[PDB]
């Protein structure tokens, strides 16, 4: 019935302000709820600050040792179908592996079940 | 359809009790559901306690090594449009990078789908 | 419209079985959904087990290095308005900083939107 | 109104395949939504794999350094009232403290609020 | 009433691109909401990137020290009953233990309670 799209990428760090075109993501033509998961291991004893821009949105990201963070982001529109992509900034280096996942869902009406019948009603406005 | 606002900031630590005006946040004029994500890497082998005040609300924050914490916070009002900002306190130092993100959503009615029709009803009050 | 109460505390460790009266929490007179966030940094290379009692409820808590854990706890009543407070137990020591946050929400009806109109109904019971 | 039951335990590791009867848990007679929180600190520089069986369900668990994981588990039945208990397996040792929490909730109808009145309806089937 | 299926596995690392047939998972014949939990401890001082493919879906995974990550994934269909299984890729080695859990739920209508009766309605279309 309902659909899904988890577009994803596994990347590296070199230039400040780089794009990362997202792997194997064909399109997200319609409306969607959206989420980010991000984490990045560090080569050596160094700490890394950074920020992640997706679609007019931006996210803070301190790190050292082990990390994992997620973000719900409500109901992003897609005005016209395109490939997913992510711009971001922060310190880069010889070794600082990156892992980033976008998950987006179609918005659908929720099914419901009614309790307490019969249910009161009047023609008149409240 | 629905809107969103993830206002954000990436900062440092010097004075006790400082404000951090939040980056690139124009306004949040209406009612909103709200959330915090906070994490802060440590320069050197030191641990840091701290607390974060947003809007009449305050949050505890122990840390060492790697950290990441989030908080749902229900339905904050915005009486009049302003720039987002965050006051906080705790130990500061030569190196203790900070990363903080606010995400807020408009509150909207949820769409629903009805199951089990036809549905019972009576004019009379229960 | 809807209200909120994030009562909070930032504390230390000395005696077994201590109370910690919670900072700046005036009252929670009515019914509420509730949540805990807890984390505690360790002075030195030591591990700490502990348990946290709130309101007839109790929570397990292993720790070393960095920690952060959260708990939803459904719909706690408040029979009469009081100050928030937390009892707990476990190993204590020279340095083991504690951070604990309670977040509670009023329970309110959810707004809804109806899909699929017109909606079928019959006077007769199913 | 609504009830709750957070049954809990703080334990050790010796035999493979042990039970841990859960502390201070009197009964859960009816239907319930359920959740696990598990974490276990390590004595020494060692890593621990393990799995946790609850009620016909089983859970994977790698660990080293600091850990914390949670699991929603939908709507477990309780055919007849009993004490909570947990079987599990994996490497054990001289020091590997365990912390495990079960939280379960009664399933109740959700209250709702209606938007968009008046609402269309027809006697005829769709 | 409602059912559940937490199929699971605890594994090792050798070849690139291996399958892991999932332990003790008999079938998931119908429609389901789905979730992943993944974490993997590291033998030695090494970091590991990897990606996890389930059902036409793929997930990023940086790691070092301690890790734990989870993913909601909406409403996966099961066209015909089969055993659960997971393909994945990344660096492998002498010691890099893996822990992976799938949790899936039947999709069911939600029960509801009505507030604000009596409820307005008109025969006429809006």
Domain holding C69: CATH number?
2.60.120
Alpha carbon separation from B20 to B11, B39, B84 (Å, rounded): 8, 15, 9
Determine the residue among B67, B109, B119 to mutate to test chain D binding: the one whose Cβ has the most chain D Cβ atoms within 10 Å. B109
d(CA A79, CA A92): 33
Pick from E3, E13, E34, E2: nearest CA to E92: E13
CB contact under 8 A, E8 and D71: no
Percentages (nearest 5) of helix, strand, coil residues in chain C: 0, 45, 55
Pairs across C and E, CB distance < 8 A: 7
What is the spatial distance between Cα E71 and Cα E37, in angstroms, rounded to a whole number?
A: 7
What is the Cα–Cα distance from D70 to C68, expressed in whole angstroms? 12
Cα(E78)–Cα(E76) distance, integer angstroms: 7
CA distance A80 to chain E (A): 23
**Among the listed residues B49, A78, B35, the one whose alpha carbon sits nearest the alpha carbon of residue C99:** B49
Q: Which of A5, A22, A6 is nearest to A88 (CA)?
A: A22
- Does residue B49 lie in a domain region? yes
Q: Is residue E111 part of a domain?
A: no
CA C121 from chain centre, in angstroms, equals 43
Separation in Å, CA of A66 to nearest CA in chain C? 10
- Can you name the residues that pair with E106 across neighbouring β-strands? E32
Task: Compute chain D's Rg from CA coordinates.
Answer: 20
* Residue A11 in domain: yes
In angstroms, the separation between the Cα of residue A90 and the nearest Cα of chain B is: 10
Among candidates D60, D76, D118 on the partner chain, residue whose Cβ is nearest the Cβ of E9: D60
How far is residue C99 from each of residues B50, C22, C39, C117, measured CA to CA in Å?
9, 11, 5, 50
Residues of B in contact with A59 (CB under 8 A): 6, 8, 101
Separation CA B25–CA B7 (nearest Å): 5
H or E stretch covering E38:
strand E32-39
Instruction: Name the residue among A23, A28, A4, A3 with its Cα closest to residue A98.
Output: A23
E67 is a domain residue: yes
DSSP string, D33-98: EEEEEEE---SSS----EEEESSS-EEE---SSS--EEEEEEEE--SS----EEEEEE---SS--E
Q: What share of chain B is helix, strand, coil (3-state, %, to 5)?
A: 0, 45, 55
- The tokens for E111 are 């029960």
DSSP A37-89: EEE---SSS----EEEESSS-EEE---SSS--EEEEEEEE--SS----EEEEE
Is residue C35 a part of any domain in this protein?
yes
User: CB distance D126–B109 less than 8 Å?
Assistant: no
Strand D69-76: give its sheet, edge to edge.
Answer: D5-11, D98-106, D32-39, D69-76
From CA C106, how far away is CA A22, in angstroms rounded? 41
Of D58, D64, D121, the CB nearest to E6: D58
| Whole-number Cα distances in Å, E126 to D115, D116, D118, E116, E123 | 14, 10, 9, 21, 9
Instruction: Note whether D118 and D14 are within 8 A (CB).
Output: no
| Bond from prior residue into E118 cis (ω within 30 degrees of 0) | yes
Nearest CA in chain A to C124: A118
Between CA C20 and CA C9 the distance in angstroms is: 8
Distance CA D55, CA C126 (A): 36
Full residue range of the structural domain in which residue C60 is found: 5-106
The chain D residue lying nearest E114, using CA atoms, is: D112
- CA–CA separation, A111 vs C118, rounded Å? 16
How many domains does chain E contain in total? Answer: 1
| Stretch 44-73 of chain E: residues touching chain B, C-beta under 8 Å | 65
Q: Is residue B22 part of a domain?
A: yes
Backbone φ, ψ for residue E114 (5° rounding): -95, 135
CB of E34 closer than 8 Å to CB of D74: no
Residue at A116 is within a domain: no
Look at residue B30 and tell me if it is in a domain.
Answer: yes
For chain D, report the end-to-end CA distance as a whole number of angstroms.
38
């Amino acid at each position: 019935i309902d659909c899904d799209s988890s577009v994803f990428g596994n990347n590296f760090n070199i230039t400040t302000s780089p794009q990362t075109l997202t792997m194997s993501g064909p399109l997200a033509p319609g409306k969607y709820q959206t989420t980010l998961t991000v984490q990045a291991l560090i080569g050596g004893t160094g700490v890394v600050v950074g920020t992640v821009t997706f679609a007019g949105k931006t996210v803070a990201y301190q790190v050292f040792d082990d990390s994992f963070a997620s973000f719900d982001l409500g109901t992003v529109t897609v005005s016209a179908s395109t490939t997913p992509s992510v711009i971001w900034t922060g310190s880069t280096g010889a070794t600082l592996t990156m892992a980033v996942n976008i998950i987006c869902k179609p918005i659908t009406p929720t099914s419901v079940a009614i309790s307490g019948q019969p249910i009161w009603t009047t023609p008149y406005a409240p």
